[PDB]
Every structure is written in C-alpha cells, then in structure tokens.
Design a protein around this motif. Structure first.
Motif, PDB file in Angstrom:
ATOM      1  N   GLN A 271      -9.366   3.538 -14.930  1.00  0.00           N
ATOM      2  CA  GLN A 271     -10.197   2.472 -14.374  1.00  0.00           C
ATOM      3  C   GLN A 271     -11.674   2.847 -14.343  1.00  0.00           C
TER       4      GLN A 271
ATOM      5  N   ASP B 269      -7.472   6.468  -4.691  1.00  0.00           N
ATOM      6  CA  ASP B 269      -6.684   6.509  -5.922  1.00  0.00           C
ATOM      7  C   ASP B 269      -7.102   5.416  -6.892  1.00  0.00           C
ATOM      8  N   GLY B 270      -7.264   4.185  -6.403  1.00  0.00           N
ATOM      9  CA  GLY B 270      -7.616   3.100  -7.308  1.00  0.00           C
ATOM     10  C   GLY B 270      -9.011   3.272  -7.866  1.00  0.00           C
TER      11      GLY B 270
ATOM     12  N   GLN C  27     -13.798  -0.317 -13.884  1.00  0.00           N
ATOM     13  CA  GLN C  27     -13.705  -0.860 -12.529  1.00  0.00           C
ATOM     14  C   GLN C  27     -14.533  -0.027 -11.556  1.00  0.00           C
TER      15      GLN C  27
ATOM     16  N   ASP D 154      -6.531   6.050   1.339  1.00  0.00           N
ATOM     17  CA  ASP D 154      -5.827   6.712   0.240  1.00  0.00           C
ATOM     18  C   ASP D 154      -5.685   5.773  -0.951  1.00  0.00           C
ATOM     19  N   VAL D 155      -5.326   4.510  -0.682  1.00  0.00           N
ATOM     20  CA  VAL D 155      -5.195   3.513  -1.746  1.00  0.00           C
ATOM     21  C   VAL D 155      -6.521   3.363  -2.468  1.00  0.00           C
TER      22      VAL D 155
ATOM     23  N   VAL E 228      -8.313  -2.584  -6.609  1.00  0.00           N
ATOM     24  CA  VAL E 228      -7.176  -2.231  -5.777  1.00  0.00           C
ATOM     25  C   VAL E 228      -7.245  -2.923  -4.430  1.00  0.00           C
ATOM     26  N   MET E 229      -8.426  -3.360  -4.011  1.00  0.00           N
ATOM     27  CA  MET E 229      -8.509  -3.972  -2.695  1.00  0.00           C
ATOM     28  C   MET E 229      -7.942  -5.384  -2.696  1.00  0.00           C
TER      29      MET E 229
ATOM     30  N   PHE F 245       2.231   1.653  -3.513  1.00  0.00           N
ATOM     31  CA  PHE F 245       1.208   2.247  -4.367  1.00  0.00           C
ATOM     32  C   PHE F 245       1.111   3.749  -4.135  1.00  0.00           C
ATOM     33  N   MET F 246       1.091   4.158  -2.875  1.00  0.00           N
ATOM     34  CA  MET F 246       0.867   5.570  -2.565  1.00  0.00           C
ATOM     35  C   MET F 246       2.036   6.447  -2.999  1.00  0.00           C
TER      36      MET F 246
ATOM     37  N   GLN G  85       0.820  -1.195   0.000  1.00  0.00           N
ATOM     38  CA  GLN G  85       0.000   0.000   0.000  1.00  0.00           C
ATOM     39  C   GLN G  85       0.864   1.259   0.000  1.00  0.00           C
TER      40      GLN G  85
ATOM     41  N   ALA H  12      -4.111  -4.627  -2.564  1.00  0.00           N
ATOM     42  CA  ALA H  12      -3.742  -4.332  -1.179  1.00  0.00           C
ATOM     43  C   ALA H  12      -3.476  -5.607  -0.384  1.00  0.00           C
ATOM     44  N   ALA H  13      -4.217  -6.666  -0.696  1.00  0.00           N
ATOM     45  CA  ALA H  13      -4.082  -7.953  -0.031  1.00  0.00           C
ATOM     46  C   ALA H  13      -3.029  -8.858  -0.663  1.00  0.00           C
TER      47      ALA H  13
ATOM     48  N   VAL I 166      -7.351  -5.812   5.537  1.00  0.00           N
ATOM     49  CA  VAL I 166      -6.998  -5.196   4.264  1.00  0.00           C
ATOM     50  C   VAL I 166      -5.830  -5.926   3.606  1.00  0.00           C
TER      51      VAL I 166
ATOM     52  N   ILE J  53      -4.008   4.207   5.679  1.00  0.00           N
ATOM     53  CA  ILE J  53      -3.496   4.427   4.325  1.00  0.00           C
ATOM     54  C   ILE J  53      -4.382   3.748   3.281  1.00  0.00           C
ATOM     55  N   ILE J  54      -5.100   2.687   3.658  1.00  0.00           N
ATOM     56  CA  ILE J  54      -5.919   1.982   2.670  1.00  0.00           C
ATOM     57  C   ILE J  54      -6.987   2.902   2.101  1.00  0.00           C
TER      58      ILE J  54
END
Lengths: 128, 118
Positions: free
Chosen positions: B26, B19-20, B29, B15-16, A112-113, A101-102, A98, A116-117, B91, B12-13
């Motif tokens: 995308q 963005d995603g 998606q 933010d992830v 993206v989830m 990515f950031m 993560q 993340a995993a 996550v 932070i997820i």
C-alpha cells in the motif's frame, strides 16, 4: 443478478443488502450511506472448496450491489478478502473486523479506516 | 509493539492503522494520507476506570503510528480527547465525529489549520 452463489453460504446476504439499499422508500438513507461511505467496496470471499467469488457494494455513485470484483461505475476503493465462514461471522456480529484483520483472517486493500468501519457501513446500508 | 492496551477496548485500531499504513503493498495509499492529512495527530483516550492512554498518528513525515502523546519526528499538531467507548463507536462507523464534537463528547486541542484535514 440473483447474487447468491453455490459454495458460498454467506452470499445470500448480498441479495438482502441489495434489496434493502435499493428499496425506493429508503431513498434517504441510501443517500446518507453514499455520502458517509463514499467508496466502492469489493468483497472477495474464499470458500473451503478453494474458490474465490466477489461482490461489490457501490456506496460512492448511485447505490448498487452486484456480482464481481469491479463496480461497472468505477473501480474499487476498498477490497476485503476473507473466508466465507468469517464473512458470515462478521455479519452475524460474532466476529470483529479489526480482530479479523489483526489475526490475519481479513486482508484489506485501500483505506484501512473505512474497512474498520465496515460493519457500521453494513448496518446503515440496508437498515429498513 | 502491539499498541493496544488493556482497559481500552478501542485501542486495537492503532494496531490496525499501523499495519494498514505500513503495508508495503500500500505504498501509494500511505503516500497520499501523508500528503493530504499533513499532520501529527494525538489521541487522548479516557476509559470508565478513570485512566488516560495516548497514541500518536504521524501523517505528515513518513507515516508512523505509536504509543504516547508525542511523535518522535516533529511533535503533535492536533490532539483529540474522547472516551474509549465513543472512539470505538467512531472507528466502527456507529458514531459521527462532528456530532461527537458538538455534544462535548470529543474535544479538539491544537491547530485548526492541520485539524481541518485529517
């Protein structure tokens, strides 16, 4: 194939992951990783020579690791693009997907989830 | 707006996810997670310092992620309360949501009707 490729130091990792996933004595976790991940994941690695090599981790059909940017049994659900050095950091646990990515070090196509995993997916994949 | 907050290692997820989800390459998606998930989801995170921080994930209108326990377009449909460590485990793929639930580690408030699809 033998999945290791010259110029990509981390690529021996795919040989290890294939062996652990395909191990006949791990039929249960393979089936568990396929039902949890439910995705074809492609890794597009970039080296400090400027090259691109790809590998696929089919965790949606029958459980295959191989060379290329497409599984023969389907198209990618996720694409992860990062340098050879950063992929090896991610597998050693000295980099977080993560944060990669950031900071722009890892690019993600698809959901993206599940990216993340990825390091969770990568443990239970071949964990003998 | 960097949505992560100090003291919440998992945040932070958000933010992830933003963005995603918002990535122009995308658009499809994005369009499917809004079409199937069809809910605003709020996350109430709790840390071992005793504090609460919340974020919303609007996935039924146009798909925005932000800070706080209220979505600006319509308001929350389902609310998830869990610890920062367990959310980070969830996550990162090292914990299962329905087992966090059956052990009391994850609490679910609101509408089952939106909650079932997420």
């Amino acid at each position: 194939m033998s999945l290791k490729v010259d110029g990509f130091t981390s690529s021996i990792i795919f040989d290890v992951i294939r062996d652990g996933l395909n191990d006949p004595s791990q039929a249960k976790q393979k089936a568990e990783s396929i039902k949890k991940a439910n995705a074809i994941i492609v890794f597009n690695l970039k080296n400090k020579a400027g090259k691109t090599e790809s590998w696929y981790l089919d965790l949606k059909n029958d459980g295959d690791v191989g060379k290329g940017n497409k599984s023969p049994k389907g198209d990618a659900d996720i694409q992860l693009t990062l340098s050879d050095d950063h992929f090896q950091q991610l597998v050693e646990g000295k980099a977080n997907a993560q944060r990669l990515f950031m900071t722009g070090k890892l690019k993600v196509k698809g959901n993206v989830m599940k990216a993340a995993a990825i390091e969770g997916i990568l443990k239970n994949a071949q964990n003998n």
